[PDB]
Each structure stands twice: as C-alpha cells, then as structure tokens.
Amino acid sequence: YNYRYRKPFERDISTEIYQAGSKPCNGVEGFNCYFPLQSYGF
C-alpha cells in the first residue's frame, strides 16, 4: 500500500482528488468521485 500516485517535474508535500464528475468531491470516494491515490498490486 506504500506506493501510490498524487505535471512536468511537479512536486509538493500535497495531493487532491480528481473531478471524475461535476461533483465537488471533498477528497471523499464515490461514483464519479474516484479516489486519486489508487492502491497498487505490488
């Protein structure tokens, strides 16, 4: 679970949710509020 994803050498000590729909997703998971830090099958 320790490997996950959040631009051209973009970096900060921060991360935020993708608007996969019109919703203001508040970082919260849901249908068309899909969580950005998806777990990896490592």
Partner 1 sequence: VYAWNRKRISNCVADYSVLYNSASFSTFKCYGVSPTKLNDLCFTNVYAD
Partner 2 sequence: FKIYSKHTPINLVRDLPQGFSALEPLVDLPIGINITRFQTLL
Ligand X SMILES: *[C@@H]1O[C@H](CO)[C@@H](O[C@@H]2O[C@H](CO)[C@@H](O)[C@H](O)[C@H]2NC(C)=O)[C@H](O)[C@H]1NC(C)=O
The binding site for partner 1 (CB under 8 A) comprises 3-6, 9, 11, 13, 15
Contact by Cβ (8 Å): 36, 18:
yes
Show the binding pattern over residues 6-35: x = contacts ligand X (CB under 6 A), - = does not: -xxxx-------------------------
Show the binding pattern over residues 1-40: x = contacts partner 2 (CB under 8 A), - = does not: --------xxxx----------------------------
Contact by Cβ (8 Å): 25, 17:
yes
Could you give the count of Cα atoms lying within 13 Å of 21 in the half-sphere of its Cβ? 11
